[PDB]
């Protein structure tokens, strides 16, 4: 219920930092905030579209942080699994 | 047992809406219901084939809804984990 707050904090912090890390790296596509936010979601949700990813060392770090913070933070699925387990 | 009902509701609602969002976007491949249903499954199951994904803003939203509703709804795996934990 409140975890979902940390998720948006990360997804936004990740989105931002990611762009910072990647610009400068010739060939990097993670360089505009908007799509960087789309990347961050894909990452936490862990979904697998492989359409956007990092190439710099730092970028991969922001990546790792988003995976940890976000894959965990997505410990929000369960709350939605509880409410949907009760009122149904 | 009943969660598996919400999954098919989402997968079908996602499949449909996704096509709506994406048509109009030059280069979008999520534009025919059939494959859009294949996309939706990949998304909820969270599997990772990266063969189909959205490019429009709205599309990514339907995406996010499918991830939440579906990755959660796929809280059906467990039921199959229980029956397969009992009668075995």
């Amino acid at each position, epitope marked *: 219920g409140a975890a979902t707050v940390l998720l948006v904090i990360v997804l936004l912090a990740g989105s*931002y930092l990611a*762009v*910072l890390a*990647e*610009r*400068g*790296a*010739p*060939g*990097a*596509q993670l*360089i*505009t*905030y*908007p799509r960087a936010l789309w990347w961050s979601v894909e990452t936490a949700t862990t979904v697998g579209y492989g359409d956007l990813y990092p190439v710099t060392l730092w970028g991969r770090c922001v990546a790792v942080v988003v995976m940890v913070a976000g894959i965990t933070s997505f410990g929000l699925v369960t709350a939605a699994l509880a409410t949907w387990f009760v009122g149904q | 047992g009943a969660a598996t009902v919400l999954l098919v509701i989402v997968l079908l609602a996602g499949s449909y809406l996704a096509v709506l969002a994406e048509r109009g*976007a*030059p*280069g979008a491949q999520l534009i025919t219901y059939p494959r859009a249903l294949w996309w939706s499954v990949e998304t909820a199951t969270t599997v990772g084939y990266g063969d189909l994904y959205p*490019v429009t803003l709205w599309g990514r939203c339907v995406a996010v809804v499918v991830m939440v509703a579906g990755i959660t709804s796929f809280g059906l795996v467990t039921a199959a984990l229980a029956t397969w934990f009992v009668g075995q």
Partner: antibody
Amino acid sequence: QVQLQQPGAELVKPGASVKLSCKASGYTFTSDWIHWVKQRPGHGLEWIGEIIPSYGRANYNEKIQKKATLTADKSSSTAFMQLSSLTSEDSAVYYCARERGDGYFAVWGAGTTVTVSS
Amino acid sequence: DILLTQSPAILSVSPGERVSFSCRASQSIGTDIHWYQQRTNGSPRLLIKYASESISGIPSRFSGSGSGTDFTLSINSVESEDIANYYCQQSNRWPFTFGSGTKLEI
């Protein structure tokens, strides 16, 4: 009102350096990047580099000899481009432009004409 | 880095005629292409963003299309004020790059 203000011209003797300025107004976001573009007379637009004021990091075009060093002053909302050891090859109009972190140059400065001559 | 090819370098059209500027990317860049207009002694001005999105303040006369590697900037019924140099610019991959420009001649 003019979003990006740049001085009209700068005369520089060969070998010397000069610091160009770009004063920005209007909405400012932590996601703004200030770009610099070089254009020689009769020729096209060449990207020089970019800087993000909110963090202070700068990136440069790798395909060209590095003549610039970018900095930014948050309190005065001014971005600077230090060009050093110039030659006549460096004579051109230098534009500054603002990008909201979404890929396009929403607005451009009027440009500073730099002439390298004795 | 992505190379943007703008050919022909000069396009001659008669008044009121529709014109199309070409921009080809060395590799697929989705719809991450933007167009700028630069009149004699003027600074560049954004005309179209993300291949086909309108910018407020720009005449309806201007439109864009394309995705992938081939893009087009079109002007319906050209008029004197459209005389200028037109440049495309990509933002799909770092670093951003510019096409070499096409001049419109009437």
